[PDB]
Design a protein around this ligand. Structure first.
Ligand code: 484
Ligand code: 484
Lengths: 237, 10, 237, 10
């Protein structure tokens, strides 16, 4: 790796730490969990909260801040769900096949999540994704990169400068490819695995989108969402 | 539109 | 009173009971209270919740259901804050000059409320209103009427059939005037007092409106509100 | 507009 490459790693890693609370102390302020879509209020707040973190992370990816305010929104609106599926993995436990966040109230089985309006059609591959990914036992360096790589994809509906964003993503893909080669022993086939994950996040992105429209369309359900969720997941161009 | 995303992106 | 008159009383009273939980057990599901607008999340949920109750109450006021869907929204969007200031009084305590709702976490001094984005310019007369009203020691029959009278005012911006709504409100004002004459000893001057209150709710309505625009305009504050609050307090016609 | 108020008013 070179200095410029490394600087990007230290940059992404610090951005992640600044936007990811390992104490999950902020969950106590979401509308309480309830075990008729009883888990929607809590999860809609968990997700709304997460989006705020993804935006905070994105603003620190080197170069992103220099994109057009419109490109920033375009990349964000379309890759937000994917970044949240990626960052959530840092709390997914293969043991109890759930997301453990500080305490028991903040531990969500495939059961809890069902009461949020989502079906197995999403929950099924979602967990599968979490397991396969959890198994790659990536480093924080690689973990944070994969997020920046996914967020800086030029193949998103809305992207104007789909050529510069093409550069950035590449400048990142290298740092990752390189690191995995130098700093990750036994990871001689990792890169290919990771990139394969960014492709699975596409089918998941799609699924959530349809399932989201279904719920979103019902006001007795959308009135449960947050102004930020509605806007980022809304289709207003 | 995107009123909230802007405020957060500055 | 006549039978028709009484039937309206039993109708309003039952509607109130069905839309007002004396246990305040639903407050445990709002985003937790915090004592930088720390009380906004909790109060925005308290108010969003209240609006849902006012709509539920309104749908049961005899005749209201027969108004035009547009008239219903017009009356609701403009008199919602007033109905919430009226129904809140059922929990206002002259002792600790606060709103006691089941427990200590759900007890809001003039202090707590300040951290919700509102200034004394509103909080001052608001409490004054609560005291003066709390002192009239109205009956539940009169209390529920005053709410229906206020909600069915034809002098609201948006009202199309400002003549029929003129009838209904009158049909209610009588039942009240009559009851106070027959069923309320010592209340030979009450009616005038109550009606005077509906006039104070107008200056308060105005104040909250301006203060609401101020907050509403800031996305770092409006993203804290609920989809229902934004819509009912929003100025979209 | 008023999408939520309708659902609740029926
Ligand atoms: C990717 C699916 C995100 C999602 C969206 C929705 C809505 O679509 C319902 C309307 C929007 C609020 C409801 C529930 C969920 C949903 C949420 C989770 C939570 C994962 C949870 C979320 C985020 C984070 C960090 O940002 C952690 C800890 O790392 C744990 C697991 C599974 C599902 C299906
Ligand atoms: C009438 C003022 C209503 C209001 C609006 C707002 C917002 O404008 C902030 C953006 C909307 C969420 C914030 C805070 C408040 C506000 C809320 C209260 C709560 C009264 C509380 C509210 C409702 C009810 C029953 O429906 C009870 C129990 O009877 C107690 C007391 C004082 C104020 C100033």
């Amino acid at each position: 790796l070179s200095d410029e490459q490394m600087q990007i790693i230290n940059s992404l890693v610090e951005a992640h730490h600044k936007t990811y609370d390992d104490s999950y102390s902020d969950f106590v302020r979401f509308r309480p969990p309830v075990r008729r879509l009883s888990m929607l209020p809590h999860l809609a707040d968990l997700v709304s909260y997460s989006i705020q973190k993804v935006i905070g992370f994105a603003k620190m990816i080197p170069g992103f801040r220099d994109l057009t305010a419109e490109d920033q929104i375009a990349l964000l609106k379309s890759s937000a769900i994917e970044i949240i599926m990626l960052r959530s993995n840092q709390s997914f436990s293969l043991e109890d096949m759930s997301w453990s966040c500080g305490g028991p109230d903040f531990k969500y089985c495939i059961n809890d999540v069902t009461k949020a309006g989502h079906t197995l059609e999403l929950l099924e591959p979602l967990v599968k994704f979490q397991v396969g990914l959890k198994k790659l036992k990536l480093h924080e360096e690689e973990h944070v990169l994969l997020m920046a790589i996914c967020l800086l994809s030029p193949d998103r509906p809305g992207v104007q400068d789909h050529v510069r964003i093409e550069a950035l993503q590449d400048r990142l893909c290298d740092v990752l490819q390189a690191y995995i080669r130098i700093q990750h022993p036994g990871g001689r086939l990792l890169y290919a695995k990771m990139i394969q994950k960014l492709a699975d996040l596409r089918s998941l992105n799609e699924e959530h989108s349809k399932q989201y429209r279904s719920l979103s369309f019902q006001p007795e359900h959308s009135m449960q969402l947050t102004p930020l969720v509605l806007e980022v997941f809304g289709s207003e161009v | 539109r995107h009123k909230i995303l802007h405020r957060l992106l500055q």
